[PDB]
Structure 1
Amino acid sequence: TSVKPIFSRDMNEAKRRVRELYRAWYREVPNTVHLFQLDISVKQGRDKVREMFKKNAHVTDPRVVDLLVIKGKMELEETINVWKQRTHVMRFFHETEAPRPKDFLSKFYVGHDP
């Protein structure tokens, strides 16, 4: 089992690079909501940014955390450039339901959702 990881050596560099990347996303969102002429308040966008960070919270391996840092860095670069469009930023959000809850009752009336 010979593994050469990407950037880190343990999760200390993982925490360091992910807090740097969160700082970048935190100061990069109000520029985009100025530029793309969006419809969203700043704190709602920041809360869904920290939601996207919290979604991947159950990852332990250093390689996977480094590769997520790579993915987030690439998409932050493509958002600070103007290479993406209003469709893509609204695609990160959800203002088109998808309304189906996690109730067993609603998954009983609407068919076949175990």
Structure 2
Amino acid sequence: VQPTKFAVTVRQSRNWADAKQRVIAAYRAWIRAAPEIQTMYSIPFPVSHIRTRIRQEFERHRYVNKLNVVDVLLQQSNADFQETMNFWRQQSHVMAFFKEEHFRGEKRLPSNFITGFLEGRN
């Protein structure tokens, strides 16, 4: 806020009820900003595709049961959110977040044993 546009002072969560509000607050800001993110970096994907990525990022950490670890993830989310909504990231940075735009594909690991073996460890 005061230092720069989307700056959030680093604070610990008081309890699990406090943490959950921040996590939902963080998700709400992210998926709300998805229309702006598309037109601001000229992303060649629909807001639906972008918003799915937001949920998966939040779902990788759905099973965390440690309060200190949540505070770390919340601070990372605020830092990524600020550097996105401020035009500090470049199209290369945001585009790299979408795993489909790598010339070797998104399925960058072998499907099963025999496809990886026939190609040579993937």
TM-score category, normalised to shorter length: 0.7 to 0.9
Q: Which moved more, 1:82-91 or 1:7-16?
A: 7-16
Unaligned runs of 5+ in 1: 1-5
TM value normalised by structure 1 = 0.85
Counterparts of 2:15 and 2:82 in 1: how far apart (Å)? 26
Residues 102 and 11 of structure 1: is their aligned pair in 2 closer, same or farther, counting only changes over 3 Å? farther
Q: 2:113 pairs with 94, 101, 104, which one? A: 104
Distance in 1 (CA, whole Å) between partners of 2:78 and 2:68 is 15
Structure 2: distance between partners of 1:44 and 1:26: 11
**Paired residue for 1:31?**
36
Over the aligned positions, Cα root-mean-square deviation in angstroms equals 1.6
Q: TM-score, normalised by structure 2?
A: 0.80
Shift of 1:105: 1.7
- The size of the alignment, in residue pairs, is 108
Distance in structure 1 (CA, Å) of the matches to 2:114 and 2:29: 42
Where 1:105 maps in the other structure, the secondary structure is helix
| Aligned equivalent of 1:82, options 74, 78, 87 | 87
Q: Residues of 1 paired with 2:16 and 2:118: CA distance?
A: 45
Q: What is the percent sequence identity of the aligned residues?
A: 33
Q: Which runs of 5+ in 2 are unaligned?
A: 1-10
Q: Does residue 58 in structure 1 map to residue 58 in structure 2?
A: no
Alpha-carbon distance in structure 1 between the residues aligned to 2:35 and 2:110: 31
CA apart distance, 1:9: 3.2
